[PDB]
Amino acid sequence: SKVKVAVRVRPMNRREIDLHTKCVVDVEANKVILNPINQPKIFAYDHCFWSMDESVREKYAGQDDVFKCLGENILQNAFDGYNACIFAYGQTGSGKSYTMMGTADQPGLIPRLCSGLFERTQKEENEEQSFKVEVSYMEIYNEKVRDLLDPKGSRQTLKVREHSVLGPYVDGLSKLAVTSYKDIESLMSEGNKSRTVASSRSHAVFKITLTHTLYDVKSGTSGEKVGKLSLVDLAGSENINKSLTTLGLVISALADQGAGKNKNKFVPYRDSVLTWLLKDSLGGNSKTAMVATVSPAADNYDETLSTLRYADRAKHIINHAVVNEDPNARIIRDLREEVEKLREQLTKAEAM
Amino acid sequence: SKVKVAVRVRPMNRREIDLHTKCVVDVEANKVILNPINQPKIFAYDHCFWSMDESVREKYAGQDDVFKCLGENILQNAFDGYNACIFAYGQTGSGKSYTMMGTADQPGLIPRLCSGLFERTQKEENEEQSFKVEVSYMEIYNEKVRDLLDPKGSRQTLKVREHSVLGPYVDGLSKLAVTSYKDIESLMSEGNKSRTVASSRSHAVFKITLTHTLYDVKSGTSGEKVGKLSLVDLAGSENINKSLTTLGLVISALADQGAGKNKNKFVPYRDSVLTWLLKDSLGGNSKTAMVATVSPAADNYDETLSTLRYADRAKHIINHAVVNEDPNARIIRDLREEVEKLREQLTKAEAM
Ligand SMILES: Nc1ncnc2c1ncn2[C@@H]1O[C@H](COP(=O)(O)OP(=O)(O)O)[C@@H](O)[C@H]1O
Ligand SMILES: Nc1ncnc2c1ncn2[C@@H]1O[C@H](COP(=O)(O)OP(=O)(O)O)[C@@H](O)[C@H]1O
Ligand SMILES: [Mg+2]
Ligand SMILES: [Mg+2]
Ligand SMILES: [Mg+2]
Ligand SMILES: [Mg+2]
Ligand SMILES: [Mg+2]
Numbered sequence: 001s002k003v004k005v006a007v008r009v010r011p012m013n014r015r016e017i018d019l020h021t022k023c024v025v026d027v028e029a030n031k032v033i034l035n036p037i038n039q040p041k042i043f044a045y046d047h048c049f050w051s052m053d054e055s056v057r058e059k060y061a062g063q064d065d066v067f068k069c070l071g072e073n074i075l076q077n078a079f080d081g082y083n084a085c086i087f088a089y090g091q092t093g094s095g096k097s098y099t100m101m102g103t104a105d106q107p108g109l110i111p112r113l114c115s116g117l118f119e120r121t122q123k124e125e126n127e128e129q130s131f132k133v134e135v136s137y138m139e140i141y142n143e144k145v146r147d148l149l150d151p152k153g154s155r156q157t158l159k160v161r162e163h164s165v166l167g168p169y170v171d172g173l174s175k176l177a178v179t180s181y182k183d184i185e186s187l188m189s190e191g192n193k194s195r196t197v198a199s200s201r202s203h204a205v206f207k208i209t210l211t212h213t214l215y216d217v218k219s220g221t222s223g224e225k226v227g228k229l230s231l232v233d234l235a236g237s238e239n240i241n242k243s244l245t246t247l248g249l250v251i252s253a254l255a256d257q258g259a260g261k262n263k264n265k266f267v268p269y270r271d272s273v274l275t276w277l278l279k280d281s282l283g284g285n286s287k288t289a290m291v292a293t294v295s296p297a298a299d300n301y302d303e304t305l306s307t308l309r310y311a312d313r314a315k316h317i318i319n320h321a322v323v324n325e326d327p328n329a330r331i332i333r334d335l336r337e338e339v340e341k342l343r344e345q346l347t348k349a350e351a352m
Numbered sequence: 353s354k355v356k357v358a359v360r361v362r363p364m365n366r367r368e369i370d371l372h373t374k375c376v377v378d379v380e381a382n383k384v385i386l387n388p389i390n391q392p393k394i395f396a397y398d399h400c401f402w403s404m405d406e407s408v409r410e411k412y413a414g415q416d417d418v419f420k421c422l423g424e425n426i427l428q429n430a431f432d433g434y435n436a437c438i439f440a441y442g443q444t445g446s447g448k449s450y451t452m453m454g455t456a457d458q459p460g461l462i463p464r465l466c467s468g469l470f471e472r473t474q475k476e477e478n479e480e481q482s483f484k485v486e487v488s489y490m491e492i493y494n495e496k497v498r499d500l501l502d503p504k505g506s507r508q509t510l511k512v513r514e515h516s517v518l519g520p521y522v523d524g525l526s527k528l529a530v531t532s533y534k535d536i537e538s539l540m541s542e543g544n545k546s547r548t549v550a551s552s553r554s555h556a557v558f559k560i561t562l563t564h565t566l567y568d569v570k571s572g573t574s575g576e577k578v579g580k581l582s583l584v585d586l587a588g589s590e591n592i593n594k595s596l597t598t599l600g601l602v603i604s605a606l607a608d609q610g611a612g613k614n615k616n617k618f619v620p621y622r623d624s625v626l627t628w629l630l631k632d633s634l635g636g637n638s639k640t641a642m643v644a645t646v647s648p649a650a651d652n653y654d655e656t657l658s659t660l661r662y663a664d665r666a667k668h669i670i671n672h673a674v675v676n677e678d679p680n681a682r683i684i685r686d687l688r689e690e691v692e693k694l695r696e697q698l699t700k701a702e703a704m
């Protein structure tokens with residue numbers, strides 16, 4: 001598990017069509033080549049989604065093209081009891097919301113994972129397996145946390161705590177159990193609503209929990225696997241930017257390790273509430289992926305190079321995803337083997 | 353744990369006031385004495401709620417008097433990880449719904465346990481304990497099962513199955529996670545609505561699940577206790593009555609055991625879907641209680657004696673309530689003690 005990095009290129013926006021601004025980005029399979037405005041810097045990633053002109057065949061990547069490559073991965077991960085995570089990263093206007101959430105006519109990953117999760121939760125209920133789904137949705141702005149699923153609209157601040165069983169958590173963040181996609185969307189389109197202005201410097205964290213119960217009908221016992229999917233919508237990469245810049249720190253420190261540099265210096269998860277809550281999604285117990293979104297416009301070249309050079313560093317982060325099973329089952333297994341080993345040493349010592 | 357039996361006496365109804373029908377029931381502490389219409393048969397129970405004339409002091413038992421004696425018990429039971437159960441039993445008009453559910457101005461046990469459960473769930477959230485609450489509400493009529501929390505109103509039939517991990521269950525019965533009393537009451541007043549007519553030969557089962565999570569902040573581990581409360585509203589005791597009469601069978605077979613009669617003949621839980629689903633609430637893993645409701649009217653004397661003689665038999669049923677913890681924790685505990693015992697026998701046999 002190294003962090004999987006996609007790059008998505010959006011179409012030229014209206015001003016750029018009018019001004020006939022020049023394309024400096026191009027895509028060749030999984031390579032994206034940053035041309036000079038006038039040296040052409042070339043980067044390679046896991047995927048490269050060219051979303052520039054719909055009227056193409058082999059090239060165009062629409063929203064369900066993005067979902068087959070990434071949403072289908074994180075979905076499989078959940079059912080196998082993994083923590084998964086997708087960050088959208090890049091400048092304002094480059095397309096972070098379109099990819100995460102989409103528009104009403106072009107749904108992004110979040111409505112498509114939700115739709116496809118209940119479609120697969122419903123298809124595998126079978127008297128040996130059940131599934132409970134909880135959902136949470138928090139926004140972070142100015143290093144404060146708000147609950148976007150709060151129906152009273154308080155926009156109250158919730159404090160972050162640490163825990164020896166949960167880890168860092170937001171105290172009083174609602175987790176809403178949900179049984180159909182219509183349950184969430186009737187809370188969560190109001191969560192996309194309840195977002196600040198002056199609007200692009202806040203991060204949205206959407207977290208879905210899948211509890212997979214499994215039944216040993218022969219043994220009569222039951223266990224539970226839990227996956228957690230976190231869909232993270234960052235502020236624009238272009239005390240208001242403490243989280244974003246700390247997230248810069250933490251991606252380089254990690255990318256340096258595995259590359260074997262500063263193996264002994266500690267990753268500063270602690271400093272911003274964003275890096276500290278997503279501690280585990282960054283070099284921890286998480287199948288994590290990143291979507292660097294870029295504008296192809298030549299007027300954006302500098303933030304585009306920033307974003308391509310973050311995306312290139314994040315691909316060197318090593319993850320430690322394990323399956324969130326029950327500690328006890330393996331403790332019993334190894335205790336029983338000591339009993340068997342010790343019972344043999346007993347009859348291997350009666351002869352004395 | 354023997355089954356706890358209350359008797360509740362309702363006021364004379366309108367016809368009985370007009371006709372000045374005579375009271376044949378009287379209550380002395382926990383004894384209720386059935387006078388002759390014209391031998392006065394006397395029975396003793398755990399409680400005796402005289403709800404006949406409100407204008408009394410030492411005698412009257414109103415709805416919160418009933419709840420302090422019984423609802424508070426079943427509530428404590430749940431938080432300690434027990435299965436609990438209250439059956440209301442008796443003839444039509446004797447007061448089974450008033451006691452279980454009550455009227456809008458006189459709430460019964462079910463709204464008062466719900467109110468008091470969230471009031472105590474909210475008072476003990478404390479970063480070492482959390483609580484998840486699920487709820488289900490099924491009706492049984494003509495040995496078919498309907499879901500009273502089904503919002504489409506299908507009134508579809510759901511089949512009963514057996515299971516080696518769940519036991520007998522109703523397949524496709526919704527279990528709705530709920531976070532406040534207003535969540536349930538906005539589904540469940542519609543469940544009291546969706547009930548048949550021609551109306552008094554159906555049983556309502558209201559089942560609330562309390563999942564108590566506990567955190568070992570020193571050990572960093574987590575366990576879950578689960579209580580189940582079943583609030584059962586029977587048909588009137590006066591293929592439509594298969595469940596009710598089978599429930600008669602099953603209460604006598606059980607009451608005979610412990611009294612040591614027919615120890616070898618098997619309790620016929622299997623025959624009706626009511627006795628088979630509530631198998632465990634009858635002589636099984638349940639802190640179970642029964643409320644025999646009676647009319648004081650002399651025109652009801654015969655069903656009153658029936659009901660008092662059921663209530664007297666049910667008090668001899670023995671329950672086997674255990675705390676629904678994790679099998680594994682005790683399996684580890686005993687495995688570790690064998691390792692310690694076997695390590696000593698090893699150094700108690702090196703000397704040979
Ligand atoms: N691939 C795309 N295809 C069509 N429209 C897009 C695409 N990407 C972005 N857009 C549109 O361009 C604007 C990009 O803004 P947005 O995606 O909200 O970016 P961010 O949140 O990253 O600033 C939005 O109005 C979006 O709907
Ligand atoms: N203790 C009581 N105090 C006042 N009214 C009662 C009492 N018990 C019953 N009633 C009223 O008498 C009628 C009894 O019917 P109900 O309780 O529905 O009985 P069941 O469901 O047992 O037939 C109801 O209308 C109820 O509201
Ligand atoms: Mg955005
Ligand atoms: Mg996650
Ligand atoms: Mg960018
Ligand atoms: Mg009734
Ligand atoms: Mg029960």
Ligand SMILES: [Mg+2]
Nearest residue numbers: 442443646659
């Ligand atoms: Mg009666």
